[PDB]
Symmetry: C3
Subunit: 192 residues, 3 copies
């Protein structure tokens, strides 16, 4: 079950958006924790979510909050369509925004952000603490490494792999594998 | 409340699409006014909508029809997802198409068109009589000026501002501020 | 009506996705036929679908299966929004994925794939056995020829026509007519 209330850590734009998704799930109230009220392990053990966009910082908090013993839940909007054979790591800090689609046998690891109207096609693997931005789309069988960032309206052709800690620019179209980390921009996306 | 019938002004493709949205809202019938039957202030005071894509012309009509005393309503498809803290100017000629998403504290001014599957992220401001085309996406905290046109599948990176009367080309990815008006195309979008 | 069961021909990623759409429609069970169990005309006459992405091969099978007397149905996800005045050829092997939008008076011919979150605007014509990929968008009054392939996140400006057997690259933005076949890539899309 879910608690009646939920802690949203982060009070900037991303947090307001997470507040909307949590309410859509039926949480009656969001208690924002400042990120800049303040956090300590003694708070009533409500469900928890880290509403910080930056992958590295979100991860360091996630590491903290877990060790302090809170359940970092997933915030999944009801309008997200998720194949029954897709796997989304449970109680793993994952945000899935409105009108996201995740298709057959895709895997979403912990800490991932799947932002508004993004698409994860069949058989993809989205590595932990990745951020698939607004409208970004992975064709089938794509491997997104840990801590990757796919910019707004970017896309990845099918059967491609993107190395851990890479950034795909807003609007960029990735058409080849990238085994070493980098920043890739344009159509086709090129190392920048 | 809404009247049982609604005037759709414009009989081209955009008008047929507005007819679909008005019916989705539950209007029982759309009475098309020619734009090329003809309009005069004496018609029964049904709800009204200007189904003209061009921002300048839509605005001049809007100016007319209001002064003649008709309520120019908003046509909002039921599948649009609109944050409770987003503000959409009421009875202000705004069209919101299927699967549009408008997130926390965004503001949509009068006369705007938000076309199919477009995305207005949190805290954006879309200036009056703008047209955000099919699939076009504004990241968070974007300011779109009055009478702007964002082309199909274009996008704007977060915290950017686009000057009044600018055009962002189809497919273009805007990555920097643009304080003076222009036509911007490509990935990254460049002054054309 | 639809039969209780349906044959899905093709057992790769595309087939798993078609299995999801068929179930969403309420088929109780998908019987996969190997494409590599095996097919012959004597099987119980359940509804049939060709879950092969390649346009040429899908067509040759479609030609076969029809001549063997099976009804090749359409698989249309419930979350697809299809104008009442749009025409989708019935029992014509058409796949329409989640969150697809087809607007007023558009026409979808037999064998077309409209993949996840794609958009077919008003008055378009999508020619038979075309594949409009993930997130690809046709503005209003676009003519897509037979056996065309529009890549992930590509788009076509309004009132354009694309010649039979053309390919529009992933991410590409087509801004001019193309009366002779080709492969078009980039923003703007250029012959490659
Ligand atoms: C510096 N910030 C960014 N930079 C680029 C790449 C810009 C670029 C550079 C050169 C060519 C094309 C694009 N894309 C994106 S997407 C994005 C988001 O919220 O989706 C952000 C914040 C960025
Ligand atoms: C001339 N009409 C247009 N021009 C361009 C820009 C074309 C361009 C030029 C150079 C490089 C890239 C793109 N985009 C768009 S979007 C669009 C729509 O309904 O979304 C239209 C009617 C246009
Ligand atoms: C070779 N396969 C592809 N190639 C290109 C074009 C790559 C390109 C080349 C040069 C410039 C830009 C893009 N687009 C796409 S979309 C796509 C899909 O499932 O949507 C595929 C399988 C491809």
């Amino acid at each position: 079950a879910r608690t009646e209330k939920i802690y949203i850590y982060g009070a900037s734009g991303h947090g307001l958006v997470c507040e909307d998704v949590a309410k859509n799930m039926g949480y009656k109230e969001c208690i924002f924790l400042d990120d800049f009220m303040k956090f300590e392990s003694t708070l009533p053990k409500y469900d928890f979510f880290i509403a910080i966009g930056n992958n590295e910082i979100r991860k360091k908090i996630y590491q903290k909050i877990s060790e302090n013993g809170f359940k970092i839940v997933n915030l999944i909007h009801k309008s997200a369509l998720i194949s029954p054979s897709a796997i989304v790591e449970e109680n793993a800090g994952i945000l899935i925004m409105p009108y996201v689609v995740i298709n057959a046998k895709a895997k979403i690891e912990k800490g991932v952000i799947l932002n508004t109207s993004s698409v994860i096609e069949h058989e993809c693997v989205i590595g932990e603490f990745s951020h698939v931005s607004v409208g970004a789309k992975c064709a089938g069988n794509v491997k997104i490494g840990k801590n990757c960032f796919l910019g707004i309206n970017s896309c990845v052709l099918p059967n491609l792999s993107l190395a851990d800690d890479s950034i795909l620019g807003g609007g960029a179209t990735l058409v080849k594998n990238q085994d070493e980390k980098g920043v890739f921009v344009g159509v086709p996306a090129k190392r920048m």
